[PDB]
Amino acid sequence: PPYIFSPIPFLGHAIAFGKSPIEFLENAYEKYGPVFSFTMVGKTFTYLLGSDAAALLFNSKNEDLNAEDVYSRLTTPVFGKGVAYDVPNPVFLEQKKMLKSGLNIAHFKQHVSIIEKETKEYFESWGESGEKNVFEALSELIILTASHCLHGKEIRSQLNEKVAQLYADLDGGFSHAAWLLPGWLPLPSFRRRDRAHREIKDIFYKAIQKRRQSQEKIDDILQTLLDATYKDGRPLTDDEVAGMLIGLLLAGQHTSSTTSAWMGFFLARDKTLQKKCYLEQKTVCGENLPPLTYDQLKDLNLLDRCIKETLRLRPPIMIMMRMARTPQTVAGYTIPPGHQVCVSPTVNQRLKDSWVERLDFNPDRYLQDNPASGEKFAYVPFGAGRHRCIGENFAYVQIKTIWSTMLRLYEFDLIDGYFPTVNYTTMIHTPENPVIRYKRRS
Amino acid sequence: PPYIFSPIPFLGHAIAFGKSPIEFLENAYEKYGPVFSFTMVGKTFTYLLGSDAAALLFNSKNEDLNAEDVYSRLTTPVFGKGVAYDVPNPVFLEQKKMLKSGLNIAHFKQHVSIIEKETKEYFESWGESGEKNVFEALSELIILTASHCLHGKEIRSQLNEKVAQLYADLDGGFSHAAWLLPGWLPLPSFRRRDRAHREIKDIFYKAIQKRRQSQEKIDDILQTLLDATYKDGRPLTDDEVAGMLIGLLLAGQHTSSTTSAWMGFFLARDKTLQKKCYLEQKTVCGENLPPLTYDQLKDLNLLDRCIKETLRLRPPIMIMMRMARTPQTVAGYTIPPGHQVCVSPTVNQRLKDSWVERLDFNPDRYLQDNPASGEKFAYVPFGAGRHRCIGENFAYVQIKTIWSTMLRLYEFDLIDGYFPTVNYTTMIHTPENPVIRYKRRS
Amino acid sequence: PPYIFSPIPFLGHAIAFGKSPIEFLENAYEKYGPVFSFTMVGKTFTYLLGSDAAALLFNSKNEDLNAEDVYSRLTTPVFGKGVAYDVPNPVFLEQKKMLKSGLNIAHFKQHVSIIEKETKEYFESWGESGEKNVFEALSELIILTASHCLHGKEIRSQLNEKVAQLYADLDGGFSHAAWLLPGWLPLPSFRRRDRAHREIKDIFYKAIQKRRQSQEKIDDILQTLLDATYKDGRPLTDDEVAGMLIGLLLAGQHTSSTTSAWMGFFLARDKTLQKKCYLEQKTVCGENLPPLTYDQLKDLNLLDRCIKETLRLRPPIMIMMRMARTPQTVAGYTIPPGHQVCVSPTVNQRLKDSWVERLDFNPDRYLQDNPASGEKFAYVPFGAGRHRCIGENFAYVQIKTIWSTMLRLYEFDLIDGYFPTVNYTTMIHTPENPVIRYKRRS
Amino acid sequence: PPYIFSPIPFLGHAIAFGKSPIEFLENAYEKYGPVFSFTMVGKTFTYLLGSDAAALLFNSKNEDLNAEDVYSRLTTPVFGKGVAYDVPNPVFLEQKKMLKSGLNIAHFKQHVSIIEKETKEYFESWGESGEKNVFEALSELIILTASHCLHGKEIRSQLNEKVAQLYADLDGGFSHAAWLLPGWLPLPSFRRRDRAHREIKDIFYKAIQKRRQSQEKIDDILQTLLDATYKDGRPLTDDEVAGMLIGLLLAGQHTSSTTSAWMGFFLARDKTLQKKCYLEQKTVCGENLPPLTYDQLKDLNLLDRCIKETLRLRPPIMIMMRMARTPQTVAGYTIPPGHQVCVSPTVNQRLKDSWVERLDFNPDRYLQDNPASGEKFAYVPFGAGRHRCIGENFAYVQIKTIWSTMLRLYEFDLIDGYFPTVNYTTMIHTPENPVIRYKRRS
Ligand code: HEM
Ligand code: HEM
Ligand code: HEM
Ligand code: HEM
Ligand SMILES: O=C(N[C@@H](Cn1ccnc1)c1ccc(-c2ccc(F)cc2)cc1F)c1ccc(-c2nnc(-c3ccccc3)o2)cc1
Ligand SMILES: O=C(N[C@@H](Cn1ccnc1)c1ccc(-c2ccc(F)cc2)cc1F)c1ccc(-c2nnc(-c3ccccc3)o2)cc1
């Protein structure tokens, strides 16, 4: 595959790529095509851009394009041993079926009123009007809603600011330092990550032992997990459950919070589209805006397309990476073992040749013919194939319910017309200076 | 000097020291005496503990024990060029005087009313009661109070969340990453630091030119700097002044916020003492508690001793360090060039030899024979000698005014008896989980 | 407990203790009594000498005096994950019961004829007379006998010089280097350990899979493991089984080889005794000396007492150690958490107070009153309590079968009256210059 | 010079280089050219690849590129005081001339018949055929031949298993632990080294005095040392002679044994070549293969080239290193003091640019134009300049004699076509699993 030369030793394209990766990759697509390699910080990466190329990653077996080889070093200290990329993929495929089994309609029905209430109670602190950081706000809110829904009421009631900070300490295990440096260096963020892991695990161990002795029946996701079994017939251990609960919260929080914050700003920019979203609430749920229900959520189809469009333009997982263990073919090229193969939903979901008015925020594009339905891997915010997301439905419930409630409470505006740029320096591309103006809804 | 061997290559005692640096130094004192050496992360350090040993550092000439050699590389990219450790010491000493001339009675009198107002207005958001993170609050207030007083009303008014983040980016330049790794690595913290430095220097350039061309006589710290002059007769360039303004704010924020936070918890744990600090407010300023004046602050003796005692047990600057350029002598040992010589106010200030009830918060210890007055270098939170603090006066005015105001507003308590342990992983040590219970002062 | 001062910082008494540990301990016993402490290498050790003091260690719960804390770091890379000190003690206790059920009379009956044949065949290479290193011979023979018996014929057949070297590479994981230095140094011994671990594991995985698939009923230790289940109901994984096989071989080899070597020299020195052992072979087994059977072993009483007395004077596991997790009281003292508590079989088994003619090799001492029967923890070559050995019976079958065969083959003598001194530079103390004179018996 | 950056603090490229040093250096050569630098375990190494660059090291004065500075620490405890890297280089140069005078034709003529006899006698144990470890056999054989030739018959008669172990203890002085850790630590290897040194010295002292007080005339290497003088007129002390005698054995053994073993396998792999070597024996010595003589060894040309080609592909001393004491210039670069400057015989002797079919074993490459005669430092298995070997002639006598003899006894083959890979974990690279098939020669 074509190789993009850089005269800068070791660093290669690091600076330019870090500054503007989408522009870097779109320029390369124009110049070298859908498949190309480059060096950055001592590693070779090979990209697959566009649906046809990306299909290799999305279709391939883990034995060929391996996820653990790239992610385990970073994730295993955060999520825990015996879970995710710390086990053989077939074990993780079973754990994912266990998790999926609890993300069902019965539970989603319960989650809606829990989330709505959590949201209304959080935003009382915003008062009738002002200008505040909506990203910080959603982050704090989403850690509460995710915990309430995915861990349950017992665990959620223990999530004070201390435990919230522990989760922030775990997050800090995902850094440039952790990627670049050996783990045996006693860096503060490493020690803080390991401390938080031990302390959260302990919180979960007690809660789990409590639940196991309890005589009561509780139909929640925790209970799905205590009841689950492998094809073996073997149940999950306390440590496996706890590892899974940590994963559920990290997965549940940052992908929803960034996406909810970008959509706030897309809707703040497009005031008519926001108005429409608010009017859809009256139409579907009634003029008197009663408590939200799951059945009503399915009927919020404009808000649905708005979320869908937010994920097109700002997918919170911007990249999917694998390690090539065996030789792989695409577009006539042969990628050898050792290349790290990458896909970028951001680049694919915005490619000129497939998306008309690619840079425009337009939810209604999905009511016409479009690459989301017309192609296989042009729209891939939740991935596809063996490593694909199991949380799309929950995420949509969480975000829909939060933004429905937020729309009912407030009208949102840009400050001096400013639309946030993308902060590329964070692992997750958050909107820069994400302060939003708000005032009471009519 | 006796060497504390570690068989661990490169790291040396890094892990044990990072976990509990104070306890590590106290144990070393008990086993090796007041002067000892060790390796940490590639480097040789020699400590001077106790008053008699520490004197070598405090009385030393910067030619012999050198500050720039150990600090320049980390500070120059934060504060700026031609300032602090980026210039020969004799030049920096003149800049300290320029700054000191501006930290005077007349200006302190203006600051009291300003700081008091900032404090009342910030703490409206807390309402009548609740449980909130006092450390975060004090950090947010103090950046305002420190800017209002040290920079001016004009620069202050421009201090929004965005610019406040710019300052945090600048704090982020003091990291292990920055200490360990080459500066040309495009790490996010490095870039943000360099970006934040240009954007702040620029906000200063604009206010520095506004003032020089204005006709209005304003008597403030900013003006003192603009008027000030070297022994040459040379005035300060815009960039010399701006860099000093940066230093001023970093010097004036977290030293006072951590300390202020700790005193909060010391007073929350000892209610009887808290009560007495409140009654002293009445007793000194009047039953009706009128606006504060600089004169009233000098008569707040119990409050003064609470601050002094907070600084004894939790000094924000845990270590002062120099590079030995010439052979030094102390307690019968000779320290060779290349060694880094260290003093710790924290250790000196709780040494078993010299402080009774050493770990107790007892502000009335200073009403009796004690090493603060009894010895020269046992109590040294603001250092001593050629490098000692010039902001001590302003720090007490800031902290006294805020906590006087805070005690008038609220009575503070612990949550479930918890006293914050020390977070050693932050540059300045911080209280862990520093959420405090508060309610309206009768 | 009384503390034994050393003026040598860091090392403390390590030199003297490395040279003459038994003498150090015996003199400390006389001077300080049965419980005392000292420092080496920044680590504080407390000894319990004599039956009454040792009782604390042997009787303690692992939650109080903990083996993992002191052994896990070295053993886990050797034996593998999920086994021995890498799991909570209760799981290891179940693992030990699985192993113990495999060490039964039906298997012992098979082992005697396996071991006799391996022994006759190995010693073909010794011819009619000569002078050779018995210790090397016993080590080479025992790795075959232990693998043949404990792993089975399939795995045994794959035990060539290459695999033997891999086991030596695993052994090399137990070193002063692995104890003293951190694991992230890429030392040759660590790399060879880790490679040997993967390569030995791989051999076991194939043999394990072979047997599961196979339809033939084989009654051997491997099969005991494949058929075993935890109280859980859960069977062992392939990796747990392989880990346990590695452990079986390492436990089965050096403990028997060193003891057998020592017994060789004790018998070479006391020719009258050696003759009596030879004649007991004729008396018990028959004048024509037919093949050994398991049932004759129990009637070989003199030989039994010879092994007992060799273990008395030369126990191959010369120390047992634990980390104190909770305060422990003995002899009026309180041992605090953090001390490593320590017993020596060697010292207990020769203490002047209880053993008459304590340094004499006198197998017949057990035919009158003696500390092994009259005291609880004076004779403890295989330990006692929760960490006690499961392999005593096997070791006696192995050693008796080998030495019965050797006595039938050869008469052994010393070389110019030399009796080997103890080599304290090896992990398990070996006899120095263990070359022995032999000639065809009768 | 270009620097190869590693983001791995301290360790630098330690792991990658230790895994595959030749591949590392050859890749570096391609990317950076003949001179480059990198960090490994806290040290800066600068390599000179190819003849023209390596010239700097081989042509350098010891005052500029110093050998004691890098080697002294490890070698002195092994060889003894007063010898080799423990004295200034001019003194060692004189000592080398003394050894040179001992390694003369009169002595070599004696050695051939000594070596042939030890060889025939040693391989008696091998029988008519089998599969045995040729590397271990050669190592054991060579310690005997080297000691018989270089120490004489008296000392050699005392070389039992015990003494051979003392020599292994000595070699054990050359460890990563001795490189990393202070000499005062009483580590096993340090203790065994120093004990072995004392005991071997005592064997040499008696033998030496035995000769000085004797009347017989013995023309052997010891006598040359005893009759030798410095320019001073000063003769060697007993400790100088004994130090040199240790050096002679350690240099004489492993360099020849590893090289001999590699050649076994090159010859077993290339049976046509092996047959030609056997036929050469008959051609030069005669059909009846009488006792070897020195004059015959000189005419065994094909065997000479097989050795030369073995040293080409597997030089036992893989690196030559010096401390830069003064700035040096090469390839338009300046190497500052403190850099460790290195040459790799293995890379030079394999370079893509110079050697056609670079990885082929082709002894006849030397009968055409080739870089061993066409360039100065492409072929340097024995070094060059002030530090070059004085043992090449003895080596060639020892190896030729042993293999001529082995070729007369046996034909050799690979086992299942396995060619030993390189074991990079040993000080001297060794062949992995060096068991070889052999059968009585026609
Ligand atoms: C808007 C919300 C979310 C987005 C955009 C998102 C995105 C993704 C993507 C792109 C992948 C594929 C990763 C890859 O191919 O390497 C993925 C996998 C996954 N996600 Fe999500 N996700 C979301 C929410 C959630 C939630 C709520 C959960 C759990 C409740 C979750 C759990 C997972 C899991 C378990 C995987 C599987 C990873 C693997 O098998 O390697 N996600 N997600
Ligand atoms: C509680 C508040 C503060 C504490 C505990 C504190 C402590 C110290 C200490 C210990 C030193 C000595 C550093 C050394 O010699 O290595 C010092 C120096 C200094 N402080 Fe502060 N300080 C505080 C507040 C301030 C403030 C508010 C300013 C300015 C407004 C300031 C400006 C300085 C300056 C300019 C130096 C001299 C640096 C040098 O000479 O190297 N400090 N401070
Ligand atoms: C002469 C031969 C042997 C001796 C002297 C010996 C000695 C010991 C001793 C003293 C302990 C207690 C360790 C402690 O408390 O820290 C022990 C434990 C043990 N031995 Fe042996 N042993 C021998 C042979 C074997 C054999 C043949 C096996 C297996 C077949 C074996 C397996 C074990 C196991 C599993 C433990 C348990 C360790 C623990 O629970 O922490 N041993 N042995
Ligand atoms: C195949 C066998 C041998 C090889 C490949 C070999 C290789 C070398 C090499 C490459 C050097 C240069 C060291 C440097 O420049 O850093 C050297 C030096 C030396 N060799 Fe050998 N050698 C061998 C056998 C011997 C023997 C048999 C002796 C003595 C009988 C010996 C004694 C020496 C001595 C004394 C030096 C001088 C070291 C110095 O001056 O720094 N070598 N050898
Ligand atoms: O090999 C170890 N223990 C042995 C003790 N043993 C042998 C026979 N009966 C008991 C061992 C323990 C458990 C097992 C084992 C356990 C479970 C199983 F299924 C199979 C085997 C096998 C063993 F060989 C071992 C080795 C070294 C150390 C060690 N810890 N610290 C050091 C140390 C300290 C200072 C300097 C050098 C080494 O060494 C601890 C344990
Ligand atoms: O044994 C060493 N050198 C050998 C090199 N040699 C062998 C044959 N021809 C030359 C050597 C050098 C001088 C002599 C010698 C000296 C004097 C004399 F009278 C006779 C012989 C003998 C030798 F064996 C030696 C070994 C190790 C090291 C060493 N330096 N660093 C390391 C090292 C570094 C990192 C990790 C581990 C080891 O190892 C340096 C020299």
UniProtKB/Swiss-Prot annotation, chains A, B, C, D:
Ubiquitously expressed with highest levels in testis, ovary, adrenal, prostate, liver, kidney and lung. Keywords: Cholesterol biosynthesis, Cholesterol metabolism, Endoplasmic reticulum, Heme, Iron, Lipid biosynthesis, Lipid metabolism, Membrane, Metal-binding, Microsome, Monooxygenase, Oxidoreductase, Steroid biosynthesis, Steroid metabolism, Sterol biosynthesis, Sterol metabolism, Transmembrane, Transmembrane helix, Ubl conjugation. GO terms for biological process: cholesterol biosynthetic process; cholesterol biosynthetic process via 24,25-dihydrolanosterol; negative regulation of amyloid-beta clearance; negative regulation of protein catabolic process; negative regulation of protein secretion; steroid biosynthetic process; sterol metabolic process. It is found in: Endoplasmic reticulum membrane; Microsome membrane. It is a single-pass membrane protein. Heme binds at C389. Inhibited by azalanstat. Inhibited by azole antifungal agents ketoconazole, itraconazole and fluconazole. Its cofactor is heme. Ubiquitinated by MARCHF6, leading to proteasomal degradation. GO terms for cellular component: endoplasmic reticulum membrane; membrane. Its EC number is 1.14.14.154. Belongs to the cytochrome P450 family. Sterol 14alpha-demethylase that plays a critical role in the cholesterol biosynthesis pathway, being cholesterol the major sterol component in mammalian membranes as well as a precursor for bile acid and steroid hormone synthesis. This is Lanosterol 14-alpha demethylase. It comes from Homo sapiens (Human).
